[PDB]
Amino acid sequence: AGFIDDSTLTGGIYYWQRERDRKDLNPDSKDYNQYTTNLSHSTANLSLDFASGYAWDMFGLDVGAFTAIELAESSASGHPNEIAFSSKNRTYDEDYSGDKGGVSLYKAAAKFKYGPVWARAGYIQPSGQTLLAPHWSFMPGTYQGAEAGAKFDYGDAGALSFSYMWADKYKAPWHIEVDDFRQNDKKTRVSYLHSLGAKYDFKNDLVLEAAFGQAQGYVNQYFTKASYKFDVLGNPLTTSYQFYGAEDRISDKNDPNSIYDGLAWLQALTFGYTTGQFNWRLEGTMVKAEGNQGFFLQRMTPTYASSNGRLDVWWDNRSDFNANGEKAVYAGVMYDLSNWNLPGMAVGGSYVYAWDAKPSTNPIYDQSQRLKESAWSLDAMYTIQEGRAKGTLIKLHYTQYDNHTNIPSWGGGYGNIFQDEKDVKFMVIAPFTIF
Ligand SMILES: CCCCCCCCOCCOCCOCCOCCO
Ligand SMILES: [Ca+2]
Ligand SMILES: [Ca+2]
Ligand SMILES: [Ca+2]
């Protein structure tokens, strides 16, 4: 046992091919009503990760890097596509002008263990109980910072986990260099993000989680979750209630750095149910997000790509369904084809219906607007089950998204809503072990 004995060297080959076409309702467009190219690219990633063992069972090191390789990109494809690297190397230099290949050092961390306590420092991903999170493409984003936590297992009485994380820079996986954190104006600095959270597992399928976070001088962020599982008619019903909240520290609602008025939140209820080869999902969300921004963010810095935060609800139906006032219901099914002697293969689909979405409360926007949006998707996926390629994911995802207004994308006070789309994503994720 130790630094070398327990070392691993692993990697990944990743392939992404996407066609996303979006209806253009920009008033002066020559292609008004047409589904023009929004994304059209073919891109690979390659990753390699060294993870040491623990010298003296207390000290180790992880180093990971990845490259992006561009096979094809239409001149009309938008930027950044989040699989290649943005042509701009840091968060706040983003101008949406290009994508490129490159290489990024995405993990470079000292790791520590001392009794029940653990820590990681350097270029790290959040790994404990806080509400800080990386963005995920094929690879995760990278914080410059440190996290420490502990776990106390009380056996029958349950297990407690908690951790604290602090960071002063970040890069999304589409940026090669870390940037600092700033307010909405992309100028006023935010000297750190930090977060504290906890989890208690009662060992009877009840799990409680909670976390608090701050962007220095700017945003307070909240998370709570209760999860439970029990049988309904002989089959497991999994349930969760989730609360996500945020407030800024700029009360003046017309200040350009004010993003929320009072407390903003996203609340969710989820149910999952398995019957034979079918896995069913029924989920719903509701949002309050008064203020200039007009939608809820799980991340504590508002600028695109600038950080991320924990959000357990993911419907893969293109829209975030997170506008001020918006309510949304999701229904989905996946069918395991093992009984057709296609083990590892699954197919499914899903549907979202959302309504009551309101714009930003900034008075320059028409406050009478109420927006509905809906979507459906289809899924086909295979996980290879034997051979050197065991664990490889091959997946095709297809979405039709419908914005039930004529508002041009990102317009009308709906700064996070875009127009109708057809989206086709094909991906291969092939992990491999060197030692
Ligand atoms: C310590 C973990 C607690 C997780 C359970 C959710 C409690 C979060 O409360 C936030 C405020 O919620 C507003 C009230 O909404 C109705 C409550 O929904 C069901 C609560 O289980
Ligand atoms: Ca380019
Ligand atoms: Ca405010
Ligand atoms: Ca429409």
Side-chain angles (χ1 to χ4, degrees), residues 1-385 387 389-435:
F3 190 90
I4 299 295
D5 286 347
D6 303 321
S7 90
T8 62
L9 184 61
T10 55
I13 302 164
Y14 319 77
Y15 177 68
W16 181 273
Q17 195 181 316
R18 185 175 201 170
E19 171 182 355
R20 193 168 79 199
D21 306 316
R22 179 183 296 169
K23 187 194 278 186
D24 179 359
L25 299 189
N26 298 334
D28 296 340
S29 172
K30 293 351 288 168
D31 291 304
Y32 193 94
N33 283 317
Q34 302 279 86
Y35 286 76
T36 63
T37 291
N38 181 254
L39 287 174
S40 174
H41 68 104
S42 166
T43 314
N45 289 180
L46 304 166
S47 67
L48 193 66
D49 270 273
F50 172 77
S52 77
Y54 288 88
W56 321 288
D57 200 28
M58 286 187 300
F59 169 83
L61 298 164
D62 299 339
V63 180
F66 75 98
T67 66
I69 299 156
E70 299 181 299
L71 287 83
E73 179 189 73
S74 167
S75 44
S77 193
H79 314 288
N81 62 47
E82 299 185 353
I83 308 300
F85 291 107
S86 180
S87 65
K88 310 315 269 195
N89 284 336
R90 303 171 184 195
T91 303
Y92 291 103
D93 294 322
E94 186 59 72
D95 68 355
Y96 306 102
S97 65
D99 284 89
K100 64 181 178 164
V103 61
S104 177
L105 176 74
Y106 87 100
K107 193 181 314 189
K111 56 190 174 180
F112 302 93
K113 288 180 347 180
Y114 192 64
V117 179
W118 61 269
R120 302 176 59 84
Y123 273 13
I124 64 166
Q125 290 75 44
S127 59
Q129 293 67 57
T130 85
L131 58 64
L132 278 168
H135 297 93
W136 273 97
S137 289
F138 286 130
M139 319 302 311
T142 308
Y143 291 93
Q144 177 175 273
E147 186 174 13
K151 182 172 174 188
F152 298 101
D153 190 353
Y154 306 107
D156 300 322
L160 167 72
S161 304
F162 59 86
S163 73
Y164 171 81
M165 181 170 166
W166 176 100
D168 61 355
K169 299 195 177 180
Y170 177 77
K171 58 185 173 175
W174 55 95
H175 286 296
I176 289 160
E177 295 174 19
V178 294
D179 212 346
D180 68 347
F181 305 117
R182 307 180 200 176
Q183 299 187 1
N184 203 66
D185 66 3
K186 307 194 287 171
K187 301 178 157 199
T188 302
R189 289 334 205 239
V190 163
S191 62
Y192 59 86
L193 309 180
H194 67 170
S195 185
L196 177 70
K199 170 170 65 182
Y200 201 87
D201 183 342
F202 292 91
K203 315 270 180 85
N204 58 5
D205 302 307
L206 177 66
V207 178
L208 301 183
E209 297 166 277
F212 174 73
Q214 300 179 300
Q216 175 270 317
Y218 194 47
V219 167
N220 298 325
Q221 198 90 21
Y222 308 89
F223 164 69
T224 72
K225 177 174 188 189
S227 305
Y228 190 51
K229 174 174 109 66
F230 60 93
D231 268 9
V232 169
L233 292 142
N235 291 308
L237 180 65
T238 62
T239 68
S240 89
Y241 164 80
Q242 300 163 38
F243 175 81
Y244 303 86
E247 57 194 1
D248 71 28
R249 308 182 64 180
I250 302 179
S251 308
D252 180 8
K253 70 167 48 60
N254 299 318
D255 187 305
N257 284 304
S258 175
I259 53 175
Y260 305 119
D261 296 349
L263 183 68
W265 45 256
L266 182 155
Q267 295 178 257
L269 197 63
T270 71
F271 303 96
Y273 192 64
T274 300
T275 68
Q277 299 302 286
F278 296 86
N279 292 327
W280 304 93
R281 291 175 58 190
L282 180 67
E283 309 184 351
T285 63
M286 171 165 187
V287 167
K288 180 182 184 173
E290 296 182 354
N292 283 329
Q293 189 164 273
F295 52 91
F296 182 81
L297 284 175
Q298 69 269 30
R299 67 172 179 266
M300 302 189 282
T301 50
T303 303
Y304 172 65
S306 61
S307 70
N308 202 21
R310 182 163 171 180
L311 173 57
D312 289 2
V313 175
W314 168 233
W315 293 340
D316 205 359
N317 268 286
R318 278 299 299 131
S319 172
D320 297 322
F321 304 103
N322 71 345
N324 180 30
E326 188 167 20
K327 298 152 240 182
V329 179
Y330 163 93
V333 67
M334 299 279 333
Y335 181 63
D336 178 325
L337 294 164
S338 39
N339 289 352
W340 306 21
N341 195 226
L342 298 164
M345 187 77 185
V347 292
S350 66
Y351 173 68
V352 178
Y353 180 93
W355 71 104
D356 248 354
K358 304 191 281 176
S360 165
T361 58
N362 185 330
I364 66 167
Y365 303 114
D366 173 7
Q367 302 297 299
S368 68
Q369 290 172 107
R370 303 285 186 279
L371 174 152
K372 305 195 185 68
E373 46 175 344
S374 62
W376 56 262
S377 300
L378 299 173
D379 276 288
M381 58 194 311
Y382 184 30
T383 302
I384 293 181
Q385 313 260 295
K390 195 262 201 184
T392 294
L393 170 65
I394 306 171
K395 177 172 159 132
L396 183 71
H397 186 80
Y398 175 52
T399 302
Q400 292 200 3
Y401 165 77
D402 194 357
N403 176 326
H404 294 284
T405 75
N406 298 332
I407 297 168
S409 295
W410 321 117
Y414 294 96
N416 199 44
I417 282 165
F418 46 81
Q419 263 298 326
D420 298 359
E421 287 183 346
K422 297 190 184 23
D423 188 33
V424 182
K425 294 177 283 180
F426 175 62
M427 64 196 77
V428 180
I429 301 169
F432 60 82
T433 296
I434 296 185
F435 61 73

